[PDB]
């Protein structure tokens, strides 16, 4: 049975180009920045340290400790949501979880 492609609306796909540029300015080592790079970026965002921890713990879907361009873009996306006056529901739904981390079966 030929199953179809599940294309969910990952809004970060609209955000990506901008955070991709930022990702490159933090010096992406082997295509993935370390916790230090994004840590100083997060403190530049001028958010409370508690928020940084929450943003990271949600955004880092790999639980790898590093942020690649999609994880980092989610990090920035969530930070922006906070800056917009709102907050993240502490839920990663299908339309926020990147396809790279979408578990099939």
């Amino acid at each position: 049975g030929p199953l179809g492609s599940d294309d969910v609306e990952w809004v970060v796909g609209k955000d990506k180009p901008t955070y991709d540029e930022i990702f490159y300015t933090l010096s992406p080592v082997n295509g993935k920045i370390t916790g230090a790079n994004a840590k100083k970026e997060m403190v530049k965002s001028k958010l409370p340290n508690t928020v940084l921890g929450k943003i990271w713990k949600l955004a880092d879907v790999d639980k790898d400790g590093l942020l690649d361009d999609e994880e980092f873009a989610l990090a920035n996306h969530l930070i922006k949501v906070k800056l917009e006056g709102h907050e993240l529901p502490a839920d990663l739904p299908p339309h926020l979880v990147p396809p790279s981390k979408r578990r099939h079966e």
Partner: peptide
Amino acid sequence: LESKPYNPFEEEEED
């Protein structure tokens, strides 16, 4: 295992 060491904003609390 509850202290998540993968977060640079969660790197140790008081000690």
